C-alpha cells in the first residue's frame, strides 16, 4: 500500500459560480479511511475545509464554508467529491484532499496529502 491521491476539477469561475472537485484514490482500500479537504489561499495560513465519514453519515464543515459546500464520496469508484456552490472571492485557494491513519474528521496535520488543484474566483 502506498497512498496516491489526485485532485481534479479546478479552474476559473465568476463569483456566485459553482465547481465540483474530484479526488481520485489509488493504492489503498479507500473504504476504510475518513477523508477531508484542505485549502490555502495565497498568502494566508492553511484552513481545513470539510471532512467525511467512512460510510458518509458524518459530514463536518468549517463555518466559513458551511452550507455552501457539500462533501461526498463514492466508495465503489474510489473517488472523493467536494461540491462548491455560491463561490466568493474569499474562496480563491489551492485545494487538497487529505487523510490520516488516526484522525481525519477534524482539522489535523494529515499524514497524506494529494497534489492539489487551484480554484480562482474572480470576475
Amino acid at each position: 500500500m502506498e497512498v496516491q491521491l489526485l485532485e481534479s476539477g479546478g479552474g476559473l469561475v465568476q463569483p456566485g459560480g459553482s465547481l465540483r472537485l474530484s479526488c481520485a484514490a489509488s493504492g489503498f482500500t479507500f473504504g476504510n479511511y475518513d477523508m477531508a479537504w484542505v485549502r490555502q489561499a495565497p498568502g494566508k495560513r492553511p484552513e481545513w475545509v470539510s471532512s467525511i465519514d467512512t460510510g458518509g453519515d458524518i459530514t463536518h464543515y468549517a463555518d466559513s464554508v458551511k452550507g455552501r459546500f457539500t462533501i461526498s464520496r463514492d466508495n465503489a469508484k474510489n473517488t472523493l467529491y467536494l461540491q462548491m456552490n455560491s463561490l466568493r472571492p474569499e474562496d480563491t485557494a489551492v485545494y487538497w484532499c487529505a487523510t490520516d491513519e488516526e484522525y481525519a474528521l477534524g482539522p489535523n496535520e494529515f499524514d497524506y496529502y494529494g497534489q492539489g488543484t487551484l480554484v480562482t474566483v474572480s470576475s
Binding site: 484542505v38 485549502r39 490555502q40 495560513r45 492553511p46 481545513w48 489551492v94 487538497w96 487529505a98 484522525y103 477534524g106 482539522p107 489535523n108 496535520e109 494529515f110 496529502y113 494529494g114 497534489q115 492539489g116
Partner: protein, 212 residues
C-alpha cells in the same frame, strides 16, 4: 527479515542555507557479514544520478550499519523529483527498495519563542535555555543555536522530534545548557529555525538573555 532500511529527505539546513542538499540511505543489518551489501541509486525520471559516497561500520552489539549519501540537485528536489535507494544483499530473498520526494500539502511558517529557565540550586555556572518552535508544516525543520554571532555545535543542544498539534501545525522544543563564562562574555543567545515556508530567506529567529 532481520534487516531494515530507511531513506531520508534533505535537511532544511543543507537545502536552504548550505545550498547542497543530500539524501542518506541507511541499511541496518542484524547478524551480518554473510555477503556484501550493494545499494544502487536511481531516479523515477531516469536522468543521471550523481556519484554517491559510502560508509560501513560495525556497532557495539555486532550489528552492521551501511550508510550511503547522495547529493541531489537543488532545482530537481524542489520541483518534485523522486529518488529511490535499492538495496541488494546475497542473503536477502528480494531487494529492499525505499523512495523519497518532497512532501506535498499546505505550508505554514514557524513561530519561535525562546525562554530562560529560573536559577536552580546546585550550580551558579549553568542555566538552561529553552526554545519553542511551533505552528509550522511540513514536519521537516532544522533548529540551530547562535552565540557571539557563531553557530554552536549540534551536540551542545537537544531538540525534540516533530509532533502534531491537531490543527495548529507541528512543533518542536530545543533545550540548551549555557555556562557562566559564555553569558558573561555576551548575554545574547539566538534560537534560529530553518524551514521551507519561512520568509523572507527561509529563516526565523528569536534572541533570549539570561539577565533581563
Amino acid at each position: 527479515r532481520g534487516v531494515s532500511a530507511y531513506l531520508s529527505r534533505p535537511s532544511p539546513f543543507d537545502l536552504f542555507i548550505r545550498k547542497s542538499p543530500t539524501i542518506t540511505c541507511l541499511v541496518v543489518d542484524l547478524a551480518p557479514s554473510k555477503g556484501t551489501v550493494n545499494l544502487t541509486w536511481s531516479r523515477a525520471s531516469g536522468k543521471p544520478v550523481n556519484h554517491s559516497t559510502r560508509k560501513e561500520e560495525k556497532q557495539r552489539n555486532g550489528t552492521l550499519t551501511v550508510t550511503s549519501t547522495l547529493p541531489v540537485g537543488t532545482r530537481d528536489w524542489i520541483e518534485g523529483e523522486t529518488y529511490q535507494c535499492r538495496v541488494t544483499h546475497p542473503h536477502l530473498p528480494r531487494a529492499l527498495m525505499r523512495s523519497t520526494t518532497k512532501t506535498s500539502g499546505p505550508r505554514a511558517a514557524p513561530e519561535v519563542y525562546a525562554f530562560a529557565t529560573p536559577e536552580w540550586p546546585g550550580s551558579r555556572d549553568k542555566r538552561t535555555l529553552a526554545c519553542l518552535i511551533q505552528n509550522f508544516m511540513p514536519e521537516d525543520i532544522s533548529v540551530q543555536w547562535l552565540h557571539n554571532e557563531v553557530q554552536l555545535p549540534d551536540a551542545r543542544h537537544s531538540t525534540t522530534q516533530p509532533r502534531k498539534t491537531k490543527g495548529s501545525g507541528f512543533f518542536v522544543f530545543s533545550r540548551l545548557e549555557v555556562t557562566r563564562a559564555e553569558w558573561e562574555q555576551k548575554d545574547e543567545f539566538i534560537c534560529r529555525a530553518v524551514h521551507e515556508a519561512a520568509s523572507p530567506s527561509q529563516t526565523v529567529q528569536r534572541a533570549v538573555s539570561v539577565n533581563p
